[PDB]
Design a protein around this nucleic acid. Structure first.
Ligand SMILES: [Zn+2]
Ligand SMILES: [Zn+2]
Ligand SMILES: [Zn+2]
Ligand SMILES: [Zn+2]
Ligand SMILES: [Zn+2]
Ligand SMILES: [Zn+2]
Ligand SMILES: [Zn+2]
Length: 197
DNA sequence: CCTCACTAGCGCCCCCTGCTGGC
DNA sequence: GCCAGCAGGGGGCGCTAGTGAGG
């Protein structure tokens, strides 16, 4: 197996060996003229231009969605149609379509928190969770109620706001031990832990 | 072969749940 | 109790860089 030996990639085929030699250290000749980003191959530039125009030739045969590359169509079919989850956890029955999703799941088993907040002692298991946590320090409220124009730090909080304040005839919770009506299920949980041990 | 598949990976934002503490 | 704040385990897509067998 003739190999590059630089990173020691083993290649049974021939043309794939010379193609890998161009990925160790090569410039980016194919330059996009809209933005300032350049690419190595014509196909990478053609796909980049499709993202500029929204051209999606790979159409899903099971739904209306379409994608730029064939890989995005394959991953979509595993999420919404075939439900094929190739990456499985060795500690439980969990499985995911992508590797990083499984690694995020494994960190729930191990408790690894590698993303430390730079302003407090908090650390999260995911990059997004740290960014959502930063709103506590910045006071940012990105989500706005489309009815009363009230702002919230999370989208789920906004949806609960619309349910509890703008939705009519919402089924409320009744305490099984006393005649107390409670709107939110979690507030029923607090009431049960206070006046009922 | 140079085009399309499949893989590997980063990046990003939504979902739902359930608790907390000021009011 | 009402309420927004806030952290937890999750689904799913956007986009790029390599790779693998191919009419
Ligand atoms: Zn190599
Ligand atoms: Zn561009
Ligand atoms: Zn589909
Ligand atoms: Zn697991
Ligand atoms: Zn912090
Ligand atoms: Zn509102
Ligand atoms: Zn009660």
């Amino acid at each position: 197996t003739f190999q590059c030996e630089l990173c020691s990639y083993t290649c049974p085929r021939r043309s794939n060996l010379d193609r890998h030699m161009k990925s160790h250290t090569d410039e980016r000749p194919h330059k996009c003229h809209l933005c300032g980003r350049a690419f190595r191959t014509v196909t990478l530039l053609r796909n980049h231009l499709n993202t500029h125009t929204g051209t999606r030739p790979h159409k899903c045969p099971d739904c209306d969605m379409a994608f730029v590359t064939s890989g995005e169509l394959v991953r979509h079919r595993r999420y919404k149609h075939t439900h094929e989850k190739p990456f499985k956890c060795s500690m439980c029955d969990y499985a995911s379509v992508e590797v990083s999703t499984l690694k995020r799941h494994i960190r729930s088993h191990t408790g690894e928190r590698p993303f430390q907040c730079s302003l407090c002692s908090y650390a999260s298991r995911d990059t997004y969770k740290l960014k959502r946590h930063m709103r506590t320090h910045s006071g940012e409220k990105p989500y706005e109620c489309y009815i009363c124009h009230a702002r919230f730090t999370q989208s789920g909080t906004m949806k609960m706001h619309i349910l509890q304040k703008h939705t009519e005839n919402v089924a409320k919770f009744h305490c099984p031990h006393c005649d107390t009506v409670i709107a939110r299920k979690s507030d029923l949980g607090v009431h049960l832990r206070k006046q009922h041990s």
